[PDB]
Amino acid sequence: TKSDREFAKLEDKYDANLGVFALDTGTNKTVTYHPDERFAYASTHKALAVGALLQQKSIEDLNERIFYTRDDLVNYNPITEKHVDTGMTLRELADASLRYSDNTAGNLILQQLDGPDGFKEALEKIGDNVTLPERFEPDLNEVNPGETHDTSTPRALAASLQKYVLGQALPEDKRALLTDWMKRNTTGDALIRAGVPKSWEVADKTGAGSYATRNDIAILWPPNGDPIVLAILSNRTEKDAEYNDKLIAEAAKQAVKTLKITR
């Protein structure tokens, strides 16, 4: 299609491979591009894992202080390194995971869910039969082409994010906590946020992994419109390649442009 041609031009421009799924939640109309192709989800899963944590814990239960050690620290611990000698509450861990992409926080949350296997069960319970958690951080970020561990698709990540942020997977109070953390993410300004109008509110979670995997999943609230779900995943040929955030911003801009046509 003509929209396909526009996404293909971005692939050529950035020497990369794109996966896009956008949904207007008012009409159920979509924009797709490789929507059922698997990509390493990288840290985008952290949003879904906090959704699952919120299904398992009351809000007051989020005050539980979790104790961990230097042996739990992995490769990117911006918040958790500072608290190894103090512990962190589950609320604090969710904040760190979602707003900073802290990998030790992400692992501690996975442990609350009974690991990748328990996280997968939680996703299956919301009807996600596509996302396939297997590993902890940091290994989950490295997926060789054709492998399926720690992968999902644009369509499925969008569907699961929608269920948690906009649908009935959580009560309203917990839904608002998740929404607030994702709205106040620190890591996504160059991605979907940079490609959509500045008047829109955005709740997003980024990812980065091997093969220049560079992802962003989001809920968007136009001021005078229905919420939009947007998942953009990408990768490149070489395991050690470097991603370009501008690919994701431009793909978001195109997704919005195409959705406009049929609204």
Side-chain angles (χ1 to χ4, degrees), residues 122-190:
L123 293 180
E124 290 161 342
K125 288 170 170 175
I126 70 168
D128 183 344
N129 300 315
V130 173
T131 302
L132 295 177
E134 186 185 283
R135 297 169 199 192
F136 288 96
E137 299 286 358
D139 289 356
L140 68 83
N141 299 293
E142 179 170 4
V143 183
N144 303 127
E147 294 171 353
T148 66
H149 72 87
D150 312 295
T151 68
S152 188
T153 66
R155 189 190 308 274
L157 291 175
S160 290
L161 187 66
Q162 178 184 15
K163 289 162 181 179
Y164 281 122
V165 176
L166 298 175
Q168 296 287 117
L170 290 167
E172 291 189 49
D173 54 6
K174 295 178 183 180
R175 191 186 311 162
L177 293 184
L178 179 60
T179 298
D180 170 67
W181 284 315
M182 295 186 68
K183 281 182 178 174
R184 299 191 298 103
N185 180 27
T186 74
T187 68
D189 289 358

Side-chain angles (χ1 to χ4, degrees), residues 90-127:
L90 287 170
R91 187 187 287 260
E92 288 170 337
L93 288 165
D95 188 289
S97 182
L98 297 182
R99 297 183 49 245
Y100 289 90
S101 217
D102 187 303
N103 283 346
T104 300
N107 278 351
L108 291 167
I109 291 164
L110 288 169
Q111 291 169 35
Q112 291 291 320
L113 301 175
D114 306 310
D117 297 353
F119 175 39
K120 187 166 67 175
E121 174 180 317
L123 293 180
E124 290 161 342
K125 288 170 170 175
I126 70 168

Side-chain angles (χ1 to χ4, degrees), residues 205-263:
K205 180 73 196 79
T206 52
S210 302
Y211 301 89
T213 292
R214 188 53 164 165
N215 300 337
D216 200 16
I217 66 173
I219 306 298
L220 319 175
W221 292 264
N224 271 341
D226 298 314
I228 294 161
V229 188
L230 179 57
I232 305 171
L233 314 180
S234 74
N235 50 37
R236 301 181 69 194
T237 299
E238 285 299 325
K239 182 182 71 71
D240 296 344
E242 296 184 85
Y243 56 73
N244 192 326
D245 293 336
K246 294 178 180 181
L247 170 64
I248 308 306
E250 290 207 71
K253 187 180 181 177
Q254 182 62 54
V256 167
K257 184 177 287 176
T258 297
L259 260 199
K260 176 191 176 313
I261 301 170
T262 54
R263 189 186 298 110

